[PDB]
Curated annotation (Swiss-Prot), chains A, B:
Post-translational modification: Phosphorylated by BMPR2; the phosphorylation is abolished by BMPR2 mutations in exon 12 which lead to truncated forms of BMPR2 and which are linked to primary pulmonary hypertension (PPH1) [MIM:178600]. The phosphorylation status is proposed to regulate the association with the cytoplasmic dynein complex and may have role in cytoplasmic dynein cargo release.
Predominant location: Golgi
Superkingdom of the organism of origin: Eukaryota
Reported tissue expression: Expressed in heart, placenta, skeletal muscle kidney, pancreas, spleen, prostate, testis, ovary, ileum and colon. Expressed in lung endothelial and smooth muscle cells (at protein level).
Protein name: Dynein light chain Tctex-type 1
Gene3D superfamilies referenced in this protein's UniProt entry, alphabetically: Tctex-1
Subunit structure: Homodimer. The cytoplasmic dynein 1 complex consists of two catalytic heavy chains (HCs) and a number of non-catalytic subunits presented by intermediate chains (ICs), light intermediate chains (LICs) and light chains (LCs); the composition seems to vary in respect to the IC, LIC and LC composition. The heavy chain homodimer serves as a scaffold for the probable homodimeric assembly of the respective non-catalytic subunits. The ICs and LICs bind directly to the HC dimer and the LCs assemble on the IC dimer. DYNLT1 and DYNLT3 compete for association with dynein IC (DYNC1I1 or DYNC1I2).
Keyword Transport among record annotations: yes
Cellular localization per UniProt: Golgi apparatus; Cytoplasm; Cytoplasm, Cytoskeleton, Spindle
Amino acid sequence: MEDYQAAEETAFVVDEVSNIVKEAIESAIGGNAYQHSKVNQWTTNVVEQTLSQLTKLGKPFKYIVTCVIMQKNGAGLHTASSCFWDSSTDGSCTVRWENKTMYCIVSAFGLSI
Amino acid sequence: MEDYQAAEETAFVVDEVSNIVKEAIESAIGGNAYQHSKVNQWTTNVVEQTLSQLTKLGKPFKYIVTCVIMQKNGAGLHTASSCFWDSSTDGSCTVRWENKTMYCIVSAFGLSI
């Protein structure tokens, strides 16, 4: 029982990362519409909140967070991520959020130290 | 002198990864115009070529490759990333490529094992 608890403590749980990413996106973006001059601040705030929460987790992981904001004007969006790590300890979580005007794709990667 | 060569061998060279990514983008994409049906193939080929070359480098790095391909239709693009590793060993390299019709941003992250 103790070993499973320790493994869960040291594991990269995708659900909590996705929750953190959703909370950061909503806090920084929320109901706000797409504005080109403010995409800089929005991406910065989302990534900073996500990395702060991931560090607050206390898990022995190096974290890499990437955020993409795109305007809804008919343009096509495709994000793909293929990597090379140890699948037993490192993880990734891609969260797609969208409102009436804007796509926000945030990919978080946690690699064991 | 030997220590410097060993460090350079084990270091995440930004320029080498940038050249690898540019080569992958040119090989997979080249001068082709934007086609939504080909974006999946282009992204997959770019990422796999980048990963293959980075693994052929022989450096003890876990590699993360993310590719974004979007049509040019007047919408402004921003891709942002902020992370948490040991800055002395792990590195990142983002390459922005564009033609008449499409933007393509590829971010590669090499983390020491």
